């Protein structure tokens with residue numbers, strides 16, 4: 001399935017190259033620009049543990065990139081995305097909720113999978 005495909009063919013986009021955040025591009029986006037730190041980003045997404053599933057396609061999910069507003073894997077991964085791109089991210093716990101988790105929904109040491117569509121980003 002999609003998480004296995006990410007494992008096998010996904011690019012390690014971590015600085016440390018510890019396979020903490022693996023990405024595959026599922027739909028190529030437009031042009032070359034990708035967001036900078038501070039940019040306001042607009043996405044649609046859904047995600048799941050590697051059993052819990054959550055989906056945000058009415059209002060976009062909005063955040064400012066690279067400011068610690070989301071889990072580290074998203075500050076890393078969304079930064080790499082072009083407008084219009086859909087990507088899969090497989091995420092080890094160090095780049096998500098770690099040992100504390102986020103109970104009850106997210107257990108300790110959870111791996112997370114997300115499908116993310118970057119709709120737009122603005123300065």
Ligand SMILES: CC[C@@H](C(=O)N1CCCC[C@H]1C(=O)O[C@H](CCc1ccc(OC)c(OC)c1)c1cccc(OCC(=O)O)c1)c1ccc(Cl)s1
Pocket residue numbers: 046047048049052053054055061062063068069070071072074096097106112113
């Ligand atoms: C419902 C939780 C969601 C989830 O894990 N996220 C939601 C979508 C973005 C990725 C990730 C997330 O960062 O959750 C964060 C959770 C809180 C959090 C923020 C920063 C963090 O580190 C810097 C952090 O680390 C533990 C946790 C979140 C959730 C809702 C909104 C939000 O920012 C916008 C705002 O506050 O209005 C951010 C998942 C969906 C399916 C999963 Cl399995 S986990």
